[PDB]
Structures are given as C-alpha cells and as structure tokens.
Design a protein around this ligand. Structure first.
Ligand SMILES: Nc1ncnc2c1ncn2[C@@H]1O[C@H](COP(=O)(O)OP(=O)(O)NP(=O)(O)O)[C@@H](O)[C@H]1O
Ligand SMILES: [Mg+2]
Length: 392
RNA sequence: UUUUUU
C-alpha cells in the first residue's frame, strides 16, 4: 500500500524501472521471489543484479539505504551461481553476528526453496560436526571465527572451491575495528576466480578506499551523503542530565513507544542488563539480548521477539546492524553510539535507527542526551548527516 | 567498548 505508492515514485530507493521478469532471473528464482511476496525490485536490486549476473561475473561494492532489500539482492546472486548437482560449498556469506547469520540463512532457504536439491550449512557457534566430516551443502552462511575454523584447522570446507563470497555489513567486516583480521584471512584462502560482493548501508571514507584495494576491479555503487538518511524515520532527542533522568524520561515515554515493538540500545552489556532489570521493576516485560548470553539463549530471545511475544528488546550494538523485524516502530538510543575512543559513531547511528522504517514503513528514533558531552556528540551526528533532530 | 573460532 505505502509500498505500492513508493515503488511508483522515481525519487524513492524502492522504485525500479524494470520488473523482476525484465531482470532475467532463472525461473526457480523468480518463483522464490514471488513466493516471498515481492512484486517489484527495489532500486539496489535492479541496479546490482545485472552487474552481479554479467558473464564473466564481476566484483561489486554497493551501498544502499537501510531496509532497501540488499539481502535479497545478494542471495539471488549466490543462488544464480550455485550448481545444486555439486555437493560441496560453492558459496560463502559472512555476517558480523550470530542472529544476523541466522536471519539471512532463513532468507536463503526461502528464496532457494524451489531447488529441491539445494541445502544450506550454518557455520555458527554451537554447530559441531565430528572430525573427518566434510560439508555437503552447496551454500554456507556463517560468522567469521567459526567459518575460519571450518576452512582450515578443522577442514570441513575447501575454500579453494568457493566461487562467490559475500560480505554483508561489509564495512564492519573489513574495518580494523571490526572483523578485518578474520575476514581477510578467510579471503586469502579463496581462489583467484572467486566473485566478491560487498554490501552495506554505510562506508566511511577510508573503508571505501580500503575496499577498493582488497576487491579486484570492482564495480561500485555509492550514495551521496544526503541520500543516506531516510525521510521516513523521524529523529528526536530528549534532554536529560543524568542516567536516572533518562530512565525517568524512558518511563514517561513507555506507553507511547510500546504501541508497536521497540528496540532500545545501550553502550555496554552491563548497562543493557541494568536497564532491563530496572524496567522489570516498573512492571514492564522486556527481553534482554547481548553477546554475553549463550547462543541457545540468544536464538530463543530473538525468535520470541520476532513472534511478537516480547514487545521491547533491550540490547547492545549486537542488534545494531541488519536485524529486520517489521513491527519495530521505535528505536531508542538510551546511550549515544560512540566508537572505542569515544568519538561519535555516525555509521552505527545510522544502522541503529535503520532498525525501524523498513521497506516503506515509517519509524521514529529517540536519542537520550544526558550531558553536554552527549549533546556535543548529537550535534556532531546531525552535522555529519545534515539532518536536523527535533527536540522532544 | 561492541562483536567475533573447536
Ligand atoms: N523487492 C522487494 N519487495 C518487497 N519487499 C522486499 C523486497 N526486497 C526486500 N524486501 C523486504 O524488505 C525488508 C528489508 O530488506 P533487507 O534485505 O533486510 O534490508 P537491507 O537492505 O539488508 N537493510 P540493512 O541490512 O538494515 O542495511 C525485508 O523484510 C525484505 O523481505
Ligand atoms: Mg541487510
């Protein structure tokens, strides 16, 4: 409905000149697409697919806004290249976090379901295969530690047979701060002829430069600064001078933000669990998710939040990227995003608020400012994006 | 700090 109107508007990133039929996907892939409920490509899908499906295959570094369909663009490229007759990994997709790997894997299964023979392996924590076992599935989705184990020490995968390598959230996967060391070690194991696809909603300048040097001869799709922020996510702030006041303000807002699901973002695992415990003392049911939890607990909590069994997720940056829950209508930055140094983290900011307003929905983001220093950070973020954040 | 392997 909003989607139908937006896909008719040439100013929207959801608009495509061409239909799925005109993109010339394999018929089993068009089946997967229409079964997903898709009607028309978004812009990134219609722009990236021809580059990725050109023969000979081409490398791509591409940027597109939050919630514009980057996942299906890359999944389709992986699925187009696989030969379901060869029973070994041919495609490798890396994600920065456990829940994101699980989520994407689900998309792969669903879009590839009309290739009865195609099967998916999960190279994630808690996923063990006896020694001397080589993996049979043609596609692998994983997080970097495990995949890097699977490739060499344990030898479950021959990396020299991989023909498509995908980095989702490509800028944190290759950043020195992020997963650079594991990603580049995995990459070095690939054969020369392997197609490399990097997708993100953001690339800091030096990361953009670095991607051009680790990806041979890439095509590039890059946004202008003004294009990065969505008109559909309203940005506010609340001025407060203490943790307790923020919590107070949060208590104040909680009805208005709980109409539809919310995610709340904290700087540390410890603040995350403190906040979740304090909200439960007020009689609110919230679910806590952070990387100190066991994977079985992490999996069960994200699934319950997806099922609407939990309305409020209190979390760390573990959920900042890529997590797609269509009912999330509010994002709260309880803490403002800062890098390891404590400088303002523009990229994370944009990904956190991108949890809401997915694929044509509207959303709201509320920043909790607790100091002058925090206020400095907020003004910095606003200047980076040139998008004014209203006082609430 | 946040993630991230057996
Ligand atoms: N052509 C399409 N038509 C309708 N819905 C779509 C289409 N492509 C993707 N979607 C839905 O769009 C939502 C967001 O897609 P997703 O691929 O997660 O966004 P993304 O670009 O990866 N964003 P981020 O990972 O947050 O930078 C998902 O629920 C998709 O199922
Ligand atoms: Mg994504």
């Amino acid at each position: 409905n909003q989607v139908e109107v937006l896909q008719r508007d040439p100013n929207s990133p959801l608009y495509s000149v061409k239909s799925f039929e005109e993109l010339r996907l394999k018929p089993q892939l068009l089946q997967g697409v229409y079964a997903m409920g898709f009607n028309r490509p978004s812009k990134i899908q219609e722009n990236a697919l021809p580059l990725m499906l050109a023969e000979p295959p081409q490398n791509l570094i591409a940027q597109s806004q939050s919630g514009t369909g980057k996942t299906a663009a890359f999944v389709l490229a992986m699925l187009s290249q696989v030969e379901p007759a060869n029973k070994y990994p041919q495609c490798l997709c890396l994600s920065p976090t456990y829940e994101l790997a699980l989520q994407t894997g689900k998309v792969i299964e669903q879009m590839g379901k009309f290739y009865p023979e195609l099967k998916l392996a999960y190279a994630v924590r808690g996923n063990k295969l006896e020694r001397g076992q080589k993996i049979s599935e043609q596609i692998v989705i994983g997080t970097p530690g495990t995949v890097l184990d699977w490739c060499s020490k344990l030898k479950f995968i021959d990396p020299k047979k991989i023909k498509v390598f995908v980095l989702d959230e490509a800028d944190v996967m290759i950043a020195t701060q992020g997963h650079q060391d594991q990603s580049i070690r995995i990459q070095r194991m690939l054969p020369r002829n392997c197609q490399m696809l990097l997708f993100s909603a953001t690339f800091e300048d030096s990361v953009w430069k670095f991607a051009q040097k680790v990806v041979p001869d890439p095509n590039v799709i890059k946004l202008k600064r003004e294009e990065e922020t969505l008109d559909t996510i309203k940005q506010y702030y609340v001025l407060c001078s203490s943790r307790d006041e923020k919590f107070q303000a949060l208590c104040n807002l909680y009805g208005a933000i709980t109409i539809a699901q919310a995610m709340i973002f904290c700087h540390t695992r410890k603040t995350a669990s403190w906040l979740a415990a304090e909200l439960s003392k007020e009689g609110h049911q919230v679910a806590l998710l952070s990387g100190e939890m066991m994977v079985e607990q992490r999996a069960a909590v994200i699934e319950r939040f997806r099922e609407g069994k939990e309305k409020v997720l209190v979390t760390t940056n573990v959920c900042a990227r890529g997590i797609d829950v269509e009912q999330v209508s509010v994002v709260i930055n309880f803490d403002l995003p800062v890098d390891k140094d404590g400088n303002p983290d523009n990229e994370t900011y944009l990904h956190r608020i991108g949890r809401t307003g997915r694929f044509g929905k509207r959303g709201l983001a509320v920043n909790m400012v607790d100091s002058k220093h925090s206020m400095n950070i907020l003004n910095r973020i606003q200047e980076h994006f040139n998008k004014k954040i209203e006082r609430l």
